[PDB]
């Protein structure tokens, strides 16, 4: 069963795989994040509560005063969104905190206070988020882009055998915290362990172990295994553990229990080890030579003399063994070291390390961290203890602790955010294990090692920074001065916090203007995963390892949507179904597969857990239960594809389009395109300009309706009902009775947005798409936005294309356009500009907005009213005066000849200088709106008073109308109540409505209905009055402009650019091209019915570029328009409804085993006619991205019309009338119109304004600048013999101050000759060198 917005024009669907998970709300990222930020969180872990609990309470300098936090409350904004955009202010809400101040007493370290005081203190305004995920920061809509940064935790990277001659691999750990110093542990080519805190100078790695209060014996105990020795009256019998015997050759007669097991010279075999274990051998006898290199393990002191025989970690030799023989020691502990399994890394590091105990290690860390100042006993301890183990200056915090515990294979996933001795020891142990051979390194691009920040997290961090600066200020104020029974308002300042948060939201690498020239462009800007920004890798210092597409992007980040150019692969876009874990990592749906059945329960798997399982492919056949119809299914298990069994599978993909993003899932036949061309198409599909009459995609994907509705452009109904009055600017839905709350009398009022400008100067304007008295259900679309159509995203028009070379007018990539495309006004777009004229307060006097401008005639001033401001609706052109403004002038010291001229003609120069705002050259529009802002000390002119009166009348009429609709509904509901339980079929309509609210009722729940409705009516009655007074105050009051500006006038032109050679067009498959001609109608190729083609593309664009998508789209569009033309023919003569039913059913039953049964016998014989009317321009067709419509189905559809199966007809020539040989492809392709308009690119300059220090022209087209004759062009001119052109190109044209004017005079005298001189930039260079000590001069 279909919704009433889908029984109008229902898109034929060609997909075969039944979907099981509907597309999630596309903007969940921004909305969920900022909802987590501004939210009462009782167990404060995220939100403003986390910041307040983290930085509060603030304790004075032992002054027995603490400032402690209680709660907070977001106020409500003074201006809503529309008024914030009109007036030019941020959209924010005042944050108000309840703070409590205590003053303790004496003889009471924790004793009770002597006085408390709680006060609600205002601290800052945080900008709220609109319903669509965009902030309004200064009148404009900003979008904060998510970030993809490396997750906090421990990462055991490697070196991959570089940076050394021998090609050794140098492993190294790193401990990245969320806030605080780094801590590495790198090897060196001698296998000594080294630590470098904060990426500083290197140190031997046992320095930090000694700093953690470990002696040498404890270090050797932690990192090694003791090999005991014994002295059994001779022969040095040694305790044995059988496993350790591997990897060595027997250097002596290995015997025990009176039996020789392995002899000298023979290596130890694994079976020999098994024999030793089986024989149960504990103690053997080894020669004294075996201790020639065995490192001792603990200190030994001769008990006779009390002297240190041998310090720990010192190689035993024959002399030492003889010395400690008679010493009375029979136990000797050594270290078990091998060359492949237990290396002696820590022992060698101890030998290199020049420290001896805790104090010297702390001094060594101090000299490394803070060189120059002399270390002290307490300063070194405080530095080391505040480095890592202090909560004020080190946090991991929670994702960091989870990654840390999991990477060392620990049971728990939550702990202290600061380090500890065991954490550092375990990192060192794991690194040593990785060196030994067991374990693998962590690749730092695995999408399980890269988090995603969002707006909530970044705004929370910035607010925390604001809080800590206020904390320092408070703790300064709390200690000094007095006790004093002050209040916790004078102690706090609200400018630092508001400054910090506003500086984040308004100026950052991640807070950028929302490009707003589509629904698709907005909805793909809000879903961006940037890698740049604060705390992320810069563009210059990112290699090729992170620019690349990883096997973990499958279902999390799109592979074919990334901006080519300087940052390709740093600005990834989120996939369709991809979500965000609790911690921040990305995850994607999968279907749980039981024994053999593909269940339809959905599990989201992050990037790590996806590795363990085996996951089938999206397009795997299954029959009515879920059993895979094959015995082998193409799965992917360990990051690599492979063919597995039917029973080993564990999960199956949830849809065939879950890999590609939302921009690249709107391209039909993507599986036929290339990858570079698909990238270009996905990037050019979001620059399309909303045209005048947005049309439809004739070949779509089914992802259009979701993008249109989920983006905020359209006006989706909230509760179902019946349209009561639809206007060009208002829709009034009357809610169904069952969806109505007991109190209200529901009638929703939707106010449409009419002709406002977007950020890219285009126009956004909603038109209602519902008739009058037409039922609507919940979630229907009531107003097509910019570039949508009945709820389906439509970015451009579909026009009859033909693939043939046409006399060279489509040579390289150009396009030859018919003239019907400009006669029908289908690519004609509307652009809206804003021009401002500020009236400042100069030193010689204020400027004015008068209409009496000096020395200008009368035709220019004919379009200005009495107050010097242009009318509304006045068709201005380039150069006309919009706002007449004159500034005061000095004396100007006029030349003698002009003095004589004035003396002759008696004319007197005026004392004011004309500086009026005038239309920029080139544009020619209609003025649609004028806004006047006046500072609150200036007498408003007549036009500002007229605008105020219009605004006030409009507001009063609006509120009266609101109360009229609502009162009509309220009394309708009251009358409907009066029909049952107190029926008055004729006793009611006679008396006036003012007494309908005061009648009787019976003892039911219906008793408390008339009273409720009456009281709601009274509430609305007073609410109208209060809203009216509020609006009148907000209108009649003055503005608050910049300091020193009296009034601002803003004029909105509405240009309308059509089409011309130069304008860039493109399809969806990345086939761009500049329009090259506008051919007359009678010169285009025509088939045997006389219909010309509208666009003639080039064949040779297809084979070299391999975007075969466009040709299949052309064939399918031809089939769709053939169905449309057949329906139109059946509808032109009024045949019947049965014939229409039969044909449309046959058109909807193609092809081979599709979904979406569309049985038309349930349509009511009148909804068939509306459907046929909406299909008379061509039946829309849906081709899901990788599910596709096969070529055989396109042939069958072409046969269902009458078009030729081959897809190619025979076209005749326009001018000669004789047919082209070799039949050519025609069909309807869907073409966009990118906003690289020619009349924004074209520029020319003869002479304008020159720069300040180096007298050279300025930059392009906004300051009337000249083109840059750079270095490569100078080499090109030197390669010729062109020495005179070069000399004029860098002295007279550009830089030489006298040559410019002399050349201009010589040109206007008809004498082409130059007198070059010397450039001014060279004199600037001479002064800037000579201003060092370097004397440079020009000697002849």
């Amino acid at each position: 069963v279909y919704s009433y917005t889908e029984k109008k024009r229902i898109r034929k669907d060609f997909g075969k795989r039944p979907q099981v998970l509907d597309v999630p709300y596309l903007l969940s990222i921004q909305l969920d994040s900022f909802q987590k930020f501004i939210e009462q969180d009782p167990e404060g872990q995220y939100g403003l509560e986390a910041a307040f609990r983290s930085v509060f309470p603030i304790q004075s300098y032992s002054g027995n005063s603490e400032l402690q936090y209680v709660s907070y409350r977001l106020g409500e904004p003074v201006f809503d969104v529309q008024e914030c955009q009109i007036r030019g202010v941020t959209y924010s809400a005042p944050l108000r905190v309840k703070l409590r101040l205590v003053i303790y007493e004496r003889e009471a370290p924790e004793g009770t206070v002597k006085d408390i005081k709680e006060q609600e203190v205002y601290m800052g305004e945080i900008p709220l988020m609109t319903d669509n995920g965009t902030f309004v920061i200064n009148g404009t809509e900003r979008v904060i882009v998510s970030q993809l940064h490396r997750s906090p935790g421990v990462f055991f990277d490697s070196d991959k055998g570089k940076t050394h001659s021998s090609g050794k691999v140098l492993y190294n750990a790193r401990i990245i915290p969320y806030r605080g110093s780094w801590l590495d542990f790198e090897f060196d080519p001698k296998d000594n362990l080294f630590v470098r805190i904060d990426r500083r100078r290197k140190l031997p790695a046992t320095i930090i172990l000694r700093a953690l209060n470990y002696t040498t014996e404890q270090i050797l105990d932690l990192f090694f295994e003791k090999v005991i020795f014994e002295i059994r009256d001779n022969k040095l019998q040694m305790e044995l553990v059988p496993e350790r015997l591997r990897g060595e050759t027997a250097s002596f007669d290995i015997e025990a229990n009176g039996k020789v097991y392995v002899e000298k010279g023979r290596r130890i075999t694994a079976r020999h080890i098994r024999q030793l274990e089986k024989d149960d051998v504990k103690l053997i006898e080894v020669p004294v030579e075996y201790i020639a290199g065995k490192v001792v393990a603990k200190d030994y002191i001769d008990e006779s003399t009390g002297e240190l025989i041998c310090a720990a970690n010192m190689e035993l030799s024959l002399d030492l063994l003889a010395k400690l023989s008679q010493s009375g020691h029979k136990r000797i502990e050594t270290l078990f070291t091998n060359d492949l399994d237990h290396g002696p890394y820590i022992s060698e590091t101890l030998r290199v390390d020049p420290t001896n105990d805790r104090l010297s290690a702390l001094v060594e860390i101090y000299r490394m961290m803070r060189p120059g100042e002399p270390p002290t006993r307490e300063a070194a301890e405080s530095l080391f203890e505040n480095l890592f183990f202090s909560e004020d200056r080190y946090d991991l915090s929670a994702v960091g602790r989870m990654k840390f515990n999991r990477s060392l294979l620990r049971e728990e996933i939550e702990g202290s955010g600061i380090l500890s001795k065991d954490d550092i020891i375990d990192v060192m142990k794991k690194l040593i294990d990785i060196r030994n051979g067991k374990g693998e390194v962590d690749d730092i691009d695995h999408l399980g090692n890269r988090r995603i920040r969002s707006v909530g997290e970044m705004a929370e961090n910035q607010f925390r920074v604001g809080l800590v600066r206020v904390e320092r200020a408070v703790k300064e104020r709390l200690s000094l001065g007095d006790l004093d029974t002050l209040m916790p308002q004078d102690m706090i300042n609200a400018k630092p916090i508001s400054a910090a948060v506003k500086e984040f939201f308004g100026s950052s690498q991640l807070s950028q203007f929302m490009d707003q020239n589509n629904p698709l462009s907005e909805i793909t800007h809000k879903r961006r995963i940037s890698a740049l920004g604060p705390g992320g890798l810069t563009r210059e210092r990112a290699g090729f390892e992170v620019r690349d597409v990883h096997p973990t992007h499958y279902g999390r980040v799109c592979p074919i949507e990334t901006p080519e150019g300087p940052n390709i692969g740093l600005i990834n876009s989120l996939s369709v179904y991809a979500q965000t874990n609790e911690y921040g990592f990305l995850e994607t749906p999968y279907r749980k597969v039981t024994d053999g059945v593909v269940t339809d329960e959905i599990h989201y798997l992050s990037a790590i857990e996806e590795g363990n399982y085996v996951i089938a492919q999206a397009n795997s056949n299954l029959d009515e239960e879920g059993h895979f119809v094959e015995d082998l299914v193409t799965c992917r298990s360990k990051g690599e594809s492979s063919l597995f069994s039917r029973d080993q599978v564990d999960y199956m993909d949830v849809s065939t389009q879950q890999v590609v993003s939302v921009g690249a899932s709107l391209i039909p036949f993507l599986e036929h395109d290339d990858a570079n061309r698909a990238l270009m198409g996905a990037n050019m599909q979001r620059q399309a300009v909303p045209t005048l009459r947005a049309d439809k995609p004739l070949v779509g994907t089914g992802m259009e309706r979701a993008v249109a509705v989920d983006s905020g452009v359209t006006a989706v109904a909230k509760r179902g009902g019946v349209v009561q009055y639809v206007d060009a600017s208002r829709i009034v839905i009357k809610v169904n009775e069952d969806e109505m709350y007991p109190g209200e009398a529901g009638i929703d009022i939707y106010n449409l947005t009419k002709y406002t400008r977007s950020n890219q100067n285009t126009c956004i304007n909603q038109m209602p798409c519902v008739s009058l008295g037409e039922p609507v259900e919940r979630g229907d679309v009531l107003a097509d936005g910019p570039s949508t159509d009945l709820g389906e995203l439509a970015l451009g028009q579909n026009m009859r294309v033909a693939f043939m070379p046409w006399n060279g007018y489509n040579f390289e990539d150009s396009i030859l356009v018919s003239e019907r495309v400009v006669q029908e006004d289908r690519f004609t777009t509307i652009h809206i500009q804003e021009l401002a004229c500020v009236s400042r307060d100069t030193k010689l006097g204020p400027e004015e907005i008068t209409a009496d401008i000096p020395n200008v005639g009368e035709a220019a001033l004919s379009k200005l009213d009495e107050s010097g401001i242009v009318y509304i609706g006045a068709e201005v052109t380039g150069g006309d005066i919009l706002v007449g403004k004159v500034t005061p002038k000095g004396e100007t010291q006029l030349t003698p000849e002009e003095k004589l001229l004035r003396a002759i003609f008696g004319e007197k120069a005026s004392d004011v200088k004309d500086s009026s705002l005038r239309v920029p050259n080139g544009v020619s529009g209609t003025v649609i709106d004028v806004q006047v802002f006046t500072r609150d000390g200036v007498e408003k002119d007549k036009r500002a008073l007229e605008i105020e009166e219009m605004q006030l009348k409009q507001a009063k009429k609006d509120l009266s109308e609101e109360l009229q609709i609502l009162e009509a509904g309220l009394f309708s509901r009251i009358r409907a109540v009066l029909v049952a339980g107190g029926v008055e079929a004729e006793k009611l309509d006679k008396l006036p409505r003012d007494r309908w609210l005061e009648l009787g009722l019976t003892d039911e729940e219906k008793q408390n209905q008339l009273e409720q409705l009456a009281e709601q009516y009274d509430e609305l009655k007073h609410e109208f009055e209060k809203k009216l007074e509020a609006k009148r105050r907000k209108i009649t009051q003055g503005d608050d402009l910049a300091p020193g500006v009296l009034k601002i006038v803003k004029v909105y032109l509405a240009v309308k650019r059509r089409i011309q050679p130069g304008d860039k067009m493109a399809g969806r498959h990345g086939n761009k091209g500049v329009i090259s001609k506008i051919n007359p109608i009678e010169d285009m190729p025509y088939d045997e019915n006389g219909t010309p083609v509208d666009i003639v593309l080039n064949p040779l664009g297809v084979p070299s570029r391999m975007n075969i998508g466009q040709i299949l789209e052309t064939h399918l569009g031809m089939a769709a328009k053939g169905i449309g033309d057949k329906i139109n023919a059946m509808l032109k003569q009024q045949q019947e409804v049965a014939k229409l039913r039969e044909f449309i059913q046959r058109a909807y039953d193609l092809g081979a085993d599709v979904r979406q049964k569309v049985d038309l016998s349930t349509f009511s014989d009148e909804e068939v006619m509306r459907l046929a009317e909406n299909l008379r321009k061509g039946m829309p067709i849906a081709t899901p991205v990788f599910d596709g419509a096969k070529e055989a189905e396109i042939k069958e559809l072409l046969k269902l019309g009458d078009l030729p199966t081959s897809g190619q007809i025979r076209l005749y020539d326009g001018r000669t009338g004789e047919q082209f040989e070799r039949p050519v492809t025609v069909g309807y392709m869907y073409m966009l119109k990118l906003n690289h308009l020619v009349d924004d690119k074209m520029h020319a300059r003869s002479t304008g304004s020159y720069s300040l220090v180096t007298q050279q022209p300025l930059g392009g087209k906004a300051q009337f600048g000249g083109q840059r004759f750079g270095e490569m062009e100078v080499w090109a001119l030197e390669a010729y013999g062109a020495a005179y052109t070069l000399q004029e190109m860098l002295t007279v044209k550009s830089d030489d101050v006298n040559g410019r004017t002399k050349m201009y005079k010589n040109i206007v005298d008809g004498n082409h000759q130059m007198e070059p001189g010397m450039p001014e930039s060279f004199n600037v260079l001479l002064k800037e060198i000579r201003s060092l000590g370097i004397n440079i001069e020009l000697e002849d």
Partner: peptide, 19 residues
């Protein structure tokens, strides 16, 4: 306390003044 002259291992013309 512990001292090995320290001149000069650092720039920082305020650290020199404090020393």
């Amino acid at each position: 306390s512990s001292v090995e002259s320290e001149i000069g291992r650092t720039t920082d013309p305020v650290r020199m003044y404090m020393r």
